[PDB]
RNA sequence: GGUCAGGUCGAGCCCGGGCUCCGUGAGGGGGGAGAAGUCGUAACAAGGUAACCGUAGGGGAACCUACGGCUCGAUCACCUCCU
RNA sequence: AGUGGUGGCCACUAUUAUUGGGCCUAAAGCGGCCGUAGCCGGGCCCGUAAGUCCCUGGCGAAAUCCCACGGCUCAACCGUGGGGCUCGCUGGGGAUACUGCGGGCCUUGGGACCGGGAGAGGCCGGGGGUACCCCCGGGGUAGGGGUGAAAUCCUAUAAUCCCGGGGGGACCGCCAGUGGCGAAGGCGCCCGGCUGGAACGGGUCCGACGGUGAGCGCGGAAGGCCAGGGGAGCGAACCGGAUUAGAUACCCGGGUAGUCCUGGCUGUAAAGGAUGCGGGCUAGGUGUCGGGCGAGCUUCGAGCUCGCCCGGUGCCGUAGGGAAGCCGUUAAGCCCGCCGCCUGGGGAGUACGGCCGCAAGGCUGAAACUUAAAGGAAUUGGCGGGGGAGCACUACAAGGGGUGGAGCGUGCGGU
RNA sequence: GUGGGGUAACGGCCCACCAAGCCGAAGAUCGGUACGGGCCGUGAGAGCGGGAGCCCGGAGAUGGACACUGAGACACGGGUCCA
């Protein structure tokens, strides 16, 4: 009910190093952890799931990793829509989504950092919770209150049906994140919005804790780099959110940012998205849609 | 005692088949009345009253003497304590069991993990409840009378 | 827990007999048991017997004469009218009148042959032959 | 302990006990719940009329060896398909494809299989309203 | 799941413990694919 | 995330006996458990994750026992707690393996007014009080009035009611019911396998304890009203206009049936009815901000 | 005896739903006799690591191993009852 | 003048068992305990007549059934006459033995108190204990370890081994037994506290207060699971070395979960005495355990030997049982009370369904179809990569000759 | 329960009001099954199984539903509608 995690508020903060070529122990640890979960997930092309006994599935890598870290990475994977997760009270279940097994078999031969980055971008492409937070950034959000306003706007258009579940849960999380920050200066717990900010942080953003808050800034060169590809296949609604002129212009007038990956990777990803846009959309509806 | 321990041990005790009381008893019915009222006045229940009477005073049993107030009944200590208003309300054995019940419940309070005494509690409680049910079938208790740990504490 | 005096008594008798001792002391003595003991003694199946006031329940002392093939207590007290004894007799005897049955009747517990002569049914209690 | 209860006033529970254990046997429960009459392909009929399709020969179970002739038939009554054994010598020669036949049970233990043939529950008696046995004797002629 | 002692005699048979476990694994997978 | 109870799917089927005066041991445990839970719940408004675990009460179910020295199953406690939260009497938060509970101001008010009243009628008045004020109770109530008979109408009503932004007092709770509906109706509408209780279900219960009858044997939980009492309940709801209609009105088909009925006995005696009326009329705005906190963002 | 107004009984028809019965129906597992194909050596003599049970994991299979229990256990011999 | 085949029903069948069945080894007693309704319940006195029994009126219609007689030739059939037919009901009179119900008496069963004795009865506080691992200081060179052999591995940045000192976690040796205690799984270091009881001796008390238990309730080995701590050794999985045709093992080197404390769940086992519990009876022989009594011994401690009584624990054993194994007063012999279970073998403890548990799972649970056996005990032989005893020449130890390399005689295979 | 209605007739059979009852573990409710008896087959009998053929009682006239005549009807060989 109170889907929050302790003692790891900075654990994902390490993920910033994904875009840069550096790698630290925690980064490769995260990479192996996500590999373990993503391969552990069943996939049928409460009936197609698997239960995660943390004590059992923490020695699978002879590591003795903390449970809160596993919880956090599970939440991240859900946020980016690669993993279907359900939580019977004090219990977690996992199922592999359509995007997974469309990225896994296709793009297994790259470096761990490459695989992580391509997964996160894939989650960005299509109208996931991640795509919502990204479009929110395009509108110029920088704090949890901005997302509160944005989702409160979005729920009152009657187009939010395809994703209403996700934003409902986000608002629920916010209801106590605000407590954990507004009066509580010591951020004891983490929340969904924080997890969403991370992942993007390791992709194109900057995240700095501020006495409970999660003050966020963009990086316009890489933001433009990903914006071009987003425009390349616009198979995701903007949620009726207006990109502010400031951001759109700042994307212009700069030294052209490189392709963040190899062009063959980008075009092949574009291909697989286009060739499966419908099936992934239906799957996503099942994740978050209502009808 | 077989009904729970299920051991057929025989530590019972025997009484000879005497119909009339013996002659060597130098006390009479009124004298034993005086002594028993003295004894229960001193704060003893029937078992210890009779033990000491048969022990120090020597009279083998008051059941060998016939009550003057009724020819068909043989005199008993309980009846005598009923004569003067020195019988108890709640029958003695059951009062004892209540007292032990509150004792064990306290010790158990300060000691949860001894499931052996949990079972013992279960046993003594079935005991008291059986005795109470029987006495209800006889009616020497108020019908609304029913066990409660708290009133037992008051007891 | 002792529940039926008569069955224990007759079983005790038979268990003495197959050994063949002389004296038996039925601890559970009752008036009905004594009437019964009179019954077959009137056909001499036992010798003399005596009552002993034990102060608790009485004890019956009985001599055996070594003439009891088997003496059982019909426990479920089947009531039976006069006209059908032959079915119940055949239920508990080896041959025609080879022994007796003890019936409790309106007048007093005693054997079955006379009860046919007097023509009064009753409640079977014991058989012996 | 002693078989119980037996008392004057305990007849009810003794009766209940025996009714409970009356479910322990097989024949009574089979009768009352009418299992055959919902599994029966013959619908309680001693003899049934059928149309034959195919001739099939089988091997006697070991150590008995021998090629037993039989036929598969569709019942005119309901339409199920069942095999009937042909007794006799040279029986299959008389029977041919698409033949009206009359068929009964084999009389095995509990009606089941007999001897050296497996599961076959039935034998023909008349083919095209002419009795098998005399054709086995040859006294009569098949139509 | 009231195991028959007769089945525990290994004559013409596999060890009962393992047949029990095999039935359990089959149970697992069947209930899983059902839901 | 999913919220719901396994196994006890029929345990609240005995709540319908509340309408009549039939008495059952199931009910005898039910209401005693209700008021035990109400007892252990404290009223320390406060509220913040740190406030929980400080001014909330931890629940260890194993100690929570019947007066028989025979325990009470956990899922039943879970179901009943969720229910009487759903009717606004409790505030329950689930940190893993430690459920934390606190009294809403309606609690320790209804209790305080009625301390020497019969248990069954005590439970009845708790239910009515919960329904009268702005809770999801009132939502499903007006949904029934509009002529909704199963989860489908509840879902459509939710989608409509969130389409205003006036759905701000009771938004988050309604969302919770939406999620439970989403993950439960499927198995309770397709394949008909009955193993979990949704918030729509337990909501229908209680009302079935008051004025509904619910036929479960359809895969779904389809419910019908009792106009005889419904006239009295409509009267008392309009007697104290302290809970909004949620912009959904009664269909004329229900209204004509309501007018046709004879005068059903007041759900309680009249003195307690007016006592409830005026105490609820008292502290109206305070309970409004309390339900705003519990089920609303601001 | 015809036409209309109201009340009542009451099949037969349309729409919505639940229930179950029957037939077919892609696809999936296991059950059982057949004789041959083939992987194995699991148990029985201590059956070659004694055998079996309960719980968990692994293995293509008999299985293997982990811990508690048992003689439906043996190899004298064994503390030691009896002798 | 019918017989044969098939199908269904009673007997066969004590394989449906009240008459009249089994549950140690053949399938069948649940792991243990508590207790509600129900069922079965000590004796004596007074009453009753509800049950129970005897007599008596009405009634249970006919036809069918049993019997004698008459008619049809006899028979079957019919008639006359007598019987009872499920017969269940009902009016009335008498009997009180027992069962029921009411009033009184008693203890023998049971419960209750009191005195010493016994015990791994518990929970709790403290204290230790030997051994092990790690670590530090000293000595010491040149290996240790392990196996059938070795190997992996540790070691010369001083390994193995000895002395000194410190840390840690578990566990409580010999005393230990055919001791004790526990309802059961189970329970052992010393001291102090808290609690539960049992047997023994006294009937001093109550007066059948009972026995069993469908429904209910409780704790309940290992292992597993949820949360937290801890993680010496050992060790699921896993990782190496070795063995092998093969090694997924057995052996060896490591090593995770586990094994420990805290709180909760999970309700399982060859939880087996493969023996559900209570009462009455029944030849004996003998030991230990514990309580009591009486003798003998006494360095005077119920400290040491002998007889008896009671309870627990064996072993042998008469009668008696049982297919036999075997059992046999601690019954699996004979009687009385209650509960559960069983009805050929697989299919199967499965399918569906229900309920419970977070999960693995638990508690209930069929059918089709298929089979002549499955299964139990014991007898003889056989066999054992079982165990004892004894034999030496178709064996071996001591000793001794020579075949196989070359040529030929002769045989067998081969061509 | 009160007070009436209609009936050949008493009654919740109906109707207006007043109350909260009544049944269920000595198994309601629900389903499966089925006319009841005199009897018959079998058995040494305890019992087991069955209600076809005659007699008695009950129910029906393809299914439903509704009238008239009448002492007697919702009337196999009388009437009206629906399927």
Swiss-Prot record, chain B:
Comp. bias regions, Basic residues: 1-17
InterPro entries in UniProt: Ribosomal_uS15, Ribosomal_uS15_arc_euk, Ribosomal_uS15_N, uS15_NS1_RNA-bd_sf
Pfam families recorded: Ribosomal_S13_N, Ribosomal_S15
Top-level taxonomic group: Archaea
Region: Disordered, residue numbers: 1-20
PROSITE patterns named in the record: RIBOSOMAL_S15
Disulfide pattern: none
One Gene Ontology term, aspect cellular component: cytosolic small ribosomal subunit
Keywords: Ribonucleoprotein, Ribosomal protein
Gene Ontology MF terms in the entry: small ribosomal subunit rRNA binding; structural constituent of ribosome
GO BP term, example: translation
Subunit field text: Part of the 30S ribosomal subunit.
Family statement: Belongs to the universal ribosomal protein uS15 family.
Protein name: Small ribosomal subunit protein uS15
Native source species: Pyrococcus furiosus (strain ATCC 43587 / DSM 3638 / JCM 8422 / Vc1)
Taxonomic lineage of the native organism: Archaea, Methanobacteriati, Methanobacteriota, Thermococci, Thermococcales
Protein encoded by which gene: rps15
From Swiss-Prot, chain C:
Keywords: Ribonucleoprotein, Ribosomal protein, RNA-binding, rRNA-binding
Top-level lineage group: Archaea
UniProt record, GO biological process: translation
PROSITE patterns linked to this entry: RIBOSOMAL_S8
Keyword rRNA-binding attributed: yes
Similarity-based family: Belongs to the universal ribosomal protein uS8 family.
HAMAP family membership: Ribosomal_uS8_A (MF_01302_A)
Name of the molecule in the record: Small ribosomal subunit protein uS8
Annotated organism of origin: Pyrococcus furiosus (strain ATCC 43587 / DSM 3638 / JCM 8422 / Vc1)
Organism ancestry: Archaea, Methanobacteriati, Methanobacteriota, Thermococci, Thermococcales
Encoding gene, per UniProt annotation: rps8
From Swiss-Prot, chain D:
GO MF annotation terms: rRNA binding; structural constituent of ribosome
InterPro entries from the UniProt entry: NA-bd_OB-fold (IPR012340), Ribosomal_uS12 (IPR006032), Ribosomal_uS12_arc (IPR022863), Ribosomal_uS12_euk/arc (IPR005680)
GO biological process: translation
Protein origin, superkingdom: Archaea
Tagged with keyword Nuclease: no
A Pfam family per the record: Ribosom_S12_S23
Keywords for the protein's UniProt record, in alphabetical order: Ribonucleoprotein, Ribosomal protein, RNA-binding, rRNA-binding
GO cellular component, one term: small ribosomal subunit
Quaternary structure note: Part of the 30S ribosomal subunit.
UniProt function note: With S4 and S5 plays an important role in translational accuracy. Located at the interface of the 30S and 50S subunits.
NCBIfam families on file: PRK04211.1 (NF003254), uS12_E_A (TIGR00982)
Family: Belongs to the universal ribosomal protein uS12 family.
PANTHER family (alphabetical): 30S RIBOSOMAL PROTEIN S12 FAMILY MEMBER
Protein name, entry field: Small ribosomal subunit protein uS12
Organism: Pyrococcus furiosus (strain ATCC 43587 / DSM 3638 / JCM 8422 / Vc1)
UniProtKB/Swiss-Prot annotation, chain E:
A cellular component term, taken from the record's GO annotations: ribosome
This protein's UniProt keywords: Ribonucleoprotein, Ribosomal protein
Annotated coiled-coil segments of the chain: none
Subunit details: Part of the small ribosomal subunit.
Family membership noted in the UniProt record: Belongs to the eukaryotic ribosomal protein eS32 family.
Further facts: Initially thought to be part of the large ribosomal subunit. Crystal structures show eS32/eL41 to be a small ribosomal subunit forming a bridge at the interface of the 2 subunits.
Protein name from the UniProt record: Small ribosomal subunit protein eS32
Name of the gene: rpl41e
